[PDB]
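Why this split exists: single-chain examples teach little about how molecules sit against one another. For that reason, every record in the complexes split bundles all components of an assembly together and asks for one structure covering all of them. Below is a record exactly as it appears in the raw files.
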Amino acid sequence: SPSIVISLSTGLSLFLGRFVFFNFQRENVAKQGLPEQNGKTHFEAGDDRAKEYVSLLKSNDPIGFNIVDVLAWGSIGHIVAYYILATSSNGYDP
Amino acid sequence: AHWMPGEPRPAYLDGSAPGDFGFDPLGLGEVPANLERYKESELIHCRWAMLAVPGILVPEALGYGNWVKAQEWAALPGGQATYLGNPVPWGTLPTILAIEFLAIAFVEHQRSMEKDPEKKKYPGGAFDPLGYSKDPKKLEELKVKEIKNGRLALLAFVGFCVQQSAYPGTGPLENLATHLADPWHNNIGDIVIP
Amino acid sequence: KGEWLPGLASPDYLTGSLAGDNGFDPLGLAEDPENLKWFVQAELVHGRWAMLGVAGMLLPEVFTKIGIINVPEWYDAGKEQYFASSSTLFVIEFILFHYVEIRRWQDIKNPGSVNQDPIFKQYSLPKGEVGYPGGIFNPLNFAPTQEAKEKELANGRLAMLAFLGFVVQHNVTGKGPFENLLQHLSDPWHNTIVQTF
Amino acid sequence: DISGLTPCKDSKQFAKREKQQIKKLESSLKLYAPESAPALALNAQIEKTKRRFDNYGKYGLLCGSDGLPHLIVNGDQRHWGEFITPGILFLYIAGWIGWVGRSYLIAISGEKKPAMKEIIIDVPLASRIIFRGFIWPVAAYREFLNGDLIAK
Ligand code: CLA
Ligand SMILES: CC(/C=C/C=C(C)/C=C/[C@@]12O[C@]1(C)C[C@@H](O)CC2(C)C)=C\C=C\C=C(C)\C=C\C=C(C)\C=C\[C@@]12O[C@]1(C)C[C@@H](O)CC2(C)C
Ligand SMILES: CC1=C(/C=C/C(C)=C/C=C/C(C)=C/C=C/C=C(C)/C=C/C=C(C)/C=C/C2=C(C)CCCC2(C)C)C(C)(C)CCC1
């Protein structure tokens, strides 16, 4: 049953992102700021298309889960689930 | 108490740390942060090997095969694991691997969140219910004993791996039995020179 | 002291203070003092081994020839079978020699540092010169005079020459050394190196 | 044996090549008188060819498919003298030369005008220096340990 495996993997990845690895990832992202050219960020140097989308990333979550994190963790879960399904599909043995 | 009498001690190693004998031929401990990280890694390796060596010795002492055959069931497709001669109903590769990954990752990430360097090596508190660490007088002796036993366990693991490599499909206990079969014939000689 | 070649001036660094000094260094190896000390220790130990080796490869042959014991020649000792395999004996020798030689090297590097017994702390070796430990190594407590050192060095040099001669003269002629001497004594003018091969 | 090769004392192309060379020589031998000097020279050539082939066969080389010997620089114990045994010898001799030259240069660095000693060699000092290279590995190792090999 592909649906059960997909849902379980997505839920496990979402839980791991939200409740376990959140602080480490947030701290690491804060450590590595926006890309800089000649000591200035891309938006500051005179690029108008590089403005950060502050409006989209704002969220009502108590800790700060946003759309981008949801998409990333769901993508990882789906990749893992589909790899599991494809591996279980055939009958190759070493 | 130096490792080699007649040889000068390094500057950064004076003997204050437990189980310190001034042994560093390659000078890897110059950076203090590197020294602390090395201490952490050494302690973790010692603890893991100490927990692992009896896990090899007690099996293969009963009717069960050895620490290598108990790993071959995962190679065969559709295999199932066994415990104490009884097949575990939930023994299969995907569930076992996922459970191991989740549990170990959570435990290790919980461990890595500690900040004080001293509290990382010796957490204390809830990890010791008996409470041997309340008295500071015996703490240094216990730490030195732990370090020495951990180093011995690491050497034991090296010996186990090398003996297994020399004789495929052979356990340490049957190796000791074969050595005791004829001490003057079954030694390291026949493998060191063909 | 003496001269190894009359009409030749001795090198300056060789001042005759060392035991067995004849000023023989045509190729000038011992110019630096550190090299001199290292080569002195080498000439000691190298040669202290050679005397024992030469006696061991010579005396049993004489005893066998005169007939008390039947012992294989020094070449065929390795081909003979013993109580244990050669590999185990080699490993035992390797470990023991590793220990003793590392002790000696540590003593040479840092004199007066490894005299104390690691196991029994009370026992120790009395202070002395490097290369002549004395103490427990001298049970009969002979006098370590300069004359004894010179005699030992001369005997060691003779042992070097004897061992080299033994090896090469067995290589050219498969016959043993004592039998070679007896063959030469049979007729000196027809059995020398030049006459035969 | 090794890499699909044939021992040189068992292959047939070796013998065929030997026969071809011998016949080529004997064709020219017939032209002259048997007692004449060219006959003696050609007989010597034939003897040399036969001896060379016999020595090559007895030395344990390995001919290939086409019939010529092949050298093995791999490191097998049956071919110690093919590459490794000569090569070490070369190094020894080579080192000798280098060492000697270096020494001579230092021996003329003290004087005020070493150029005159470079373009016009002196024989006494050079003859003193020449024989010191017979033990070059030992002196070189001692100098490397001491630290006088590299300038500072
Ligand atoms: C006198 C001894 C001598 C020594 C010790 C060296 C040493 C060295 N050479 Mg130099 N070199 C020399 C002479 C010497 N050279 C001469 C005469 C020339 C001009 C032909 C060169 C031209 C040269 C080049 C173009 C290069 C080196 C390089 C090197 C280095 C690598 C080794 C090698 O590639 O050799 C190369 C060797 C040669 C091409 C020929 C040398 C053979 C000469 C003729 C022998 C010396 C003989 C001399 C006349 C003896 C007189 C002494 C007598 C009076 C007692 C090494 C440091 C290489 C490098 O830079 O490495 C980092 C490199 O690229 N050398
Ligand atoms: C140690 C030694 C021999 C040791 C032998 C041993 C232990 C033998 C043991 C055994 O036999 C037994 C007992 C029993 C057998 O069953 C087994 C074996 C194993 C066979 C020889 C050294 C032999 C050493 C030799 C020959 C050294 C010679 C050095 C020379 C001549 C140097 C000369 C110069 O260096 C000077 C002095 C000054 C410079 O200026 C000029 C030059 C010319 C460079
Ligand atoms: C509202 C809310 C909630 C809920 C939430 C949820 C429920 C969520 C979910 C979410 C999700 C559920 C998500 C998901 C996502 C997903 C994704 C993002 C995916 C991706 C995918 C991919 C990327 C794929 C790919 C591929 C392909 C295409 C093909 C094949 C191959 C592969 C697999 C590679 C809660 C109650 C909690 C709280 C309150 C509020």
